[PDB]
């Protein structure tokens, strides 16, 4: 059972060089059915990721994107949990009707006030939002689990497949922790 | 009622600065050359003054 | 009536609230968005002199307001509802929009919400100066002691535009 | 802001800044000494004014 | 008096210490907080011109200051007593309040304590320019080198407001 | 003897990543009858904690919150002992009555004089009124005893249960010592 | 000797967290009879101590205090020897009498000229100076020798009992020498 930490460390060392760039575009396609206790730890993971990778207004340009394999209804609950946590996110959906112009908007930054319009984008795995992703291809594309990415334009796009079953392993891979 | 606060006081002229643009727009009718204002002096005394010049800038 | 209301409409920085009732005005669903747009183009237009965000309150169900939000989004108007779906967050309804005066940007233009108890309490927390009522809504629990209540009796949005000095004729 | 915006108001003169060079070049015949401008004062009132001086530089 | 108290009451930067003896003023418990509130709003309003903190040394036990502190906190008025439980602290009573001029914040607006020996010892360390004696209290053990003691006799707080130029009429 | 510390090293390394953020809100719920010599080492521990995580005026912009399981009169003696060491704290008690608007107050800061009003919120009561101040919620909640956290809102709040016996172990876990 | 230097290293690592703070009040209760060649090496120890912990005018603010178990006439010889070394100290004695105002005075600094009126406090262990110590109190209190530290208020003050027999070990414990 022990011979897993070596593979995890090797993959983490593979992933670190691209995670040290201050300004990069990172998209995460996540399947909730793979990561255990996803509902009770997703907001904490997003907050911890933002605390390290999107926290400097002058340096951490571009915002991460999260795409889940769920229905539109769960996005409402996730947004409700995020707003009560004082985290500003955009989902694009305005009542189960997706809007292209809302998901591609660039946040406005007030450096003198240390404020951004939103910190991340969280949306479902609908067909109308995958086409929005292909409009602006990301520098790095991270796929968690075995979600199908056949509808995404993966031409000249760096794809990293993470084989995990816990949020601690995800944090360890993304250089968010030293243990595990 | 309250308009602003004094900046420089001289026996010839006294300079007063308006608090905000909203207050100025609220009572810009009374802020005209020749009209009268009162400036506090201590706790129970008031000094009556007449406006001589206005200058509002947003450079 | 129009000349009675021409004061307090010429003041740039002034809070105006509306209690429009969709039932009274005909063709409300197809003209409310246009009326709001032409109101904001005249009253909430300047970025430095118009520092107050108008609030529109409708007497309707909480579910029907998402359609209005979608229509406003489609017509490219930024508004805040305060509802994330059957849930009201008072920390979002009572937030001052962020303004950047270099490219003429303001976070949102108007506040369109329901007539629930939570939004009424939020309105009471930060009272306005002029309160306009259209359709005879039961404006009872608003603590209207400071505001200049002005009931308006209309039948179509054209009369509303004429009363608010947005039109020269009916 | 069809032509420009006011940047300084005094009981002696008013300073108006044209937004862009394109706007000034387009309506340059109208912006001559002796012509007339309309500065908004409020939401329904206007102030008619006559151009007295023009400056194009010092930046 | 009055018309002779109006000097030294028209000076913004001046220290005034009040030695009030309860049971001499009618309804002292239900009116002392209001009297302090409508005294501070006249003599402790300016942020840069009013640089002296009033002191209200009541003649009571070491206890009963907690009730006054609670009633002042309930009115959003910040005061310092110098007593934490039943122990007096010399450093906590003789601290100059920290104020910021861009805002309108002062750490505390008044000092209220009992008629103990420790506080009177602290009073002599930082003497005042004017002393107001209300009722009959032992003025001894208090240095009066450069202090203008003004003995005041009243029956209610209306008379005190009238004498302190806080009330034109009765 | 040389086994407990080796196990505590793992917990210390787990806690390190979240303690390096300059601006973070941390709440402590510690049971007094679990740490030896609590009545003689508590305020020294608080002073040591404020010398590392609430020392810099510009960077550290959050105020700690220590909540004890005691009664109201026992909190008064701690407050007396703190002011003797020139440590400014607030407790929310103006006697036997709690005040919400006093405990839930943001300290005022003057950069030019190194003044932060009160440096900690050390209300030593797990009262039903103090526990009803979930209006703010903290990034990291540390439980340093067998307290009954039933009225608290643990949703979307990081729980960091610590099992110790001495104050030196607590300082070691919170990266204040490196010996025991 | 190897075991003794190992124990000295273990204790030395226990004092480095508090010795790295630029501004801190440090009091040394020293028994001259427990240190070899105290008369011929105390001035050099004081000079070396201030060359590291009281050398920066802007950062190092607090003035160290030394309290010896000697007589008032023996202190005069030390004061004579200090001024011949061009180092300024205050003893609190204007003769055979001790003055409260001459011992609690905070030194004045001229940053542009790099000048402070005195660099250290050195006095005997009489009952008069103990009252002065209890009036201000120190963050750290160091005791070398078997002096009777009972008249001064030890409550709420860190006590570090250093067991040494020569100035080399004292310097090693206080992080001034790498090899004894």
DSSP string for residues in E107-164 = S-SEEEE-S-HHHHHHHHHS--SEEEEESS----SS--SS-EEEEE--SSHHHHHHHT
C34 shares contact with chain B (CB less than 8 Å):
no
B25 contacts in C (CB within 8 Å)? 11-13, 49
Neighbouring CB atoms inside 10 A of F145's CB total 18
- How far is it, in rounded angstroms, from Cα C108 to Cα A18? 37
Q: Which of F44, F81, F177 sits opposite G158 (nearest CB)?
A: F44
**How many angstroms away from the CA of D50 is the closest CA of chain B?**
20
Q: How far apart are the first and last CA of chain E?
A: 15
List own/partner pairs for E160-167 with CB under 8 A and 24 or more apart. Answer: E160/E25, E160/E35, E160/E134, E161/E35, E161/E38, E162/E2, E163/E1, E163/E2, E163/E5, E164/E5, E164/E9, E164/E39, E165/B43, E165/B44, E165/E2, E165/E5, E165/E6, E165/E9, E166/E38, E166/E39, E166/E42
| Nearest CA among F92, F168, F174 for reference residue F140 | F174
Q: Do F179 and G21 touch (CB under 8 A)?
A: no
F–G: how many Cβ contacts below 8 A?
A: 18
The length of chain C, given as a count of residues: 170
3-state DSSP helix/strand/coil percent for chain G, to nearest 5?
Answer: 35, 15, 45
Q: What is the DSSP letter of E15?
A: -
Q: Which of C69, C76, C92 sits opposite A95 (nearest CB)?
A: C69
F156 contacts in A (CB within 8 Å)? 43-44, 81, 84-85
G160 contacts in F (CB within 8 Å)? none
Q: Which of B54, B57, B58 sits opposite D11 (nearest CB)?
A: B54
C13 shares contact with chain B (CB less than 8 Å):
yes
**3-state SS of chain C?**
CCCCCCCCCCCCCCCEEECCCCCCCCCHHHHHHHHHHHHHCCCCCCCCCCCCCCEEECCCCCCCHHHHHHHHHHCCCCEECCECCCCECHHHHCCCCCEECCCCEECCCEEEECCCHHHHHHHHHCCCCEEEEECCCCCCCCCCCCCEEEEECCCCHHHHHHHCCCCCCC
- List the subunits that have 3+ CB pairs under 8 angstroms with A: C, F
Q: Which of B53, B55, B58 sits opposite D7 (nearest CB)?
A: B58
Backbone φ and ψ of C49, nearest 5°: -100, -20
Sign of CA dihedral C20, C24, C25, C27: positive
Q: Do D7 and B53 touch (CB under 8 A)?
A: no
Q: Do E12 and B42 touch (CB under 8 A)?
A: yes
Give the C-alpha distances (Å, rounded to integers) separating G174 from G53, G63, G169.
10, 16, 8
- Find out whether C130 and C6 touch, Cβ atoms under 8 Å: no
- How far is it, in rounded angstroms, from Cα G119 to Cα G89? 6
Helix-helix angle C28-40:C65-74, to 10 degrees: 50
Q: Do A110 and C100 touch (CB under 8 A)?
A: yes
- How far is it, in rounded angstroms, from Cα E13 to Cα G141? 44
In chain F, which residue's Cα lies nearest the Cα of G154? F40
A99 shares contact with chain C (CB less than 8 Å):
yes
- List the subunits that have 3+ CB pairs under 8 angstroms with B: C, D, E
Q: Do A94 and C105 touch (CB under 8 A)?
A: no
- List the subunits that have 3+ CB pairs under 8 angstroms with E: B, F
HSE-up of residue F66 (Cα within 13 Å, Cβ side): 22
- How far is it, in rounded angstroms, from Cα E141 to Cα A62? 71
Residue A96 three-state SS? coil
Backbone φ and ψ of A59, nearest 5°: -105, -45
**How many angstroms away from the CA of B51 is the closest CA of chain C?**
24
Q: In the structure, do chain E and chain B come into contact, i.e. share 3 or more CB pairs under 8 Å?
A: yes
- List the subunits that have 3+ CB pairs under 8 angstroms with F: A, E, G
Q: Do F14 and A179 touch (CB under 8 A)?
A: yes
- Find out whether G31 and G145 touch, Cβ atoms under 8 Å: yes
**How many angstroms away from the CA of C47 is the closest CA of chain B?**
13
Q: Do F17 and A178 touch (CB under 8 A)?
A: yes
| Nearest CA among C53, F47, G149, B59 for reference residue D17 | B59
The continuous run of DSSP H or E covering F71 comes out as none
Q: What is the resolution of this structure in A?
A: 3.0
Mutate to test the interface with B, among D9, D16, D47 (most CBs of B within 10 A): D9
Residue D36 three-state SS? strand
- How far is it, in rounded angstroms, from Cα B6 to Cα C65? 50
Q: Do B25 and C51 touch (CB under 8 A)?
A: no
B21 contacts in C (CB within 8 Å)? 13, 48-49
C12 shares contact with chain B (CB less than 8 Å):
yes
A51 contacts in F (CB within 8 Å)? 21
Q: In the structure, do chain F and chain B come into contact, i.e. share 3 or more CB pairs under 8 Å?
A: no
E45 shares contact with chain B (CB less than 8 Å):
no
HSE-up of residue A179 (Cα within 13 Å, Cβ side): 12
Backbone φ and ψ of A140, nearest 5°: -130, 135
- Find out whether C75 and C33 touch, Cβ atoms under 8 Å: yes
- Classify burial at C56, counting beta carbons within 10 Å of its beta carbon; exposed 0-12, middle 13-18, buried 19 or more: buried
In chain F, which residue's Cα lies nearest the Cα of A87? F156
- Find out whether F87 and F50 touch, Cβ atoms under 8 Å: yes
**How many angstroms away from the CA of C48 is the closest CA of chain B?**
10
F115 shares contact with chain E (CB less than 8 Å):
yes
Of chain A residues 48-87, which have a CB less than 8 A from chain F?
51, 81, 84-85
Q: Which of C10, C42, C43 sits opposite D45 (nearest CB)?
A: C10
In chain C, which residue's Cα lies nearest the Cα of A97? C70
Query: What residues are paired with A164 via a beta bridge?
Result: none
Query: What residues are paired with B14 via a beta bridge?
Result: B9
The length of chain D, given as a count of residues: 59
Q: Do E9 and B45 touch (CB under 8 A)?
A: no
- How far is it, in rounded angstroms, from Cα A174 to Cα A30? 14
- How far is it, in rounded angstroms, from Cα G82 to Cα G88? 7
Residue F179 three-state SS? coil
Q: Do C85 and A80 touch (CB under 8 A)?
A: yes
Q: Do B44 and E10 touch (CB under 8 A)?
A: yes
Residues 6+ apart with CB under 8 A from G101: none
- How far is it, in rounded angstroms, from Cα E87 to Cα F130? 25
Q: In the structure, do chain E and chain F come into contact, i.e. share 3 or more CB pairs under 8 Å?
A: yes
Q: What is the DSSP string of chain B?
A: ---EEEEEE-SS-EEEEES-HHHHHHT-SS-STT-EEEEEETTTEEEEEE-----EE--
Residues 6+ apart with CB under 8 A from C124: C141, C142, C143
Q: Do E73 and F94 touch (CB under 8 A)?
A: yes
Per DSSP bridges, beta strands C148-152 and C99-100 are: unpaired
Q: Which of B54, B58, B59 sits opposite D10 (nearest CB)?
A: B54
In chain F, which residue's Cα lies nearest the Cα of E76? F101
A97 contacts in C (CB within 8 Å)? 70
- Find out whether G36 and G45 touch, Cβ atoms under 8 Å: no
Q: What is the DSSP string of F79-138?
A: HHHHHTTT--EE-SBSSSSB-HHHHS-PPP-BGGGTB-S-SEE------TTTTT-TTT--
- How far is it, in rounded angstroms, from Cα E5 to Cα E70? 32
Q: What is the DSSP letter of A38?
A: H
The distance of Cα A154 from the centroid of its chain, to the nearest Å, equals 17
In chain B, which residue's Cα lies nearest the Cα of E167? B44
G61 contacts in F (CB within 8 Å)? none
Q: What is the DSSP letter of F76?
A: H
Q: Do C13 and B58 touch (CB under 8 A)?
A: no
């Amino acid at each position: 059972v022990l011979t897993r930490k070596q593979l995890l460390k090797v993959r983490k060392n593979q992933l670190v060089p691209s995670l040290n760039i201050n300004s990069r575009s990172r998209y995460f396609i996540i399947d909730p059915d793979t990561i255990d206790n996803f509902d009770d730890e997703f907001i904490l993971f997003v907050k911890d990721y933002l605390d390290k990778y999107n926290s400097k207004i002058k340096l951490h340009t571009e915002t991460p994107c999260f795409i889940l394999k769920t229905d539109v209804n769960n996005l409402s609950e996730y947004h409700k949990r995020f707003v009560s946590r004082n985290i500003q996110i955009i989902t694009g959906y305005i009542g189960d009707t997706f809007y292209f112009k809302e998901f591609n908007k660039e946040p406005k930054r007030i450096i003198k006030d240390n404020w951004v319009e939103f910190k991340a984008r969280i949306s479902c795995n609908s067909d109308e939002v995958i086409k929005c992703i292909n409009y602006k291809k990301c520098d790095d594309l991270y796929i968690v689990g075995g979600v199908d990415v056949s509808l995404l334009d993966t031409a000249d796009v760096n794809i990293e497949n993470l084989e995990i079953n816990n949020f601690r392993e995800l944090k360890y891979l993304l250089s968010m922790l030293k243990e595990i | 009622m309250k308009i602003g606060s004094v900046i420089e006081s001289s026996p010839h002229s006294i300079l007063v600065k308006i608090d905000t643009l909203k207050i100025f727009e609220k009572a810009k009718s009374a802020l005209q050359i020749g009209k009268y204002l009162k400036i506090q002096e201590g706790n129970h005394n008031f000094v009556l003054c007449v406006i001589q010049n206005i200058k509002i800038s947003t450079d």
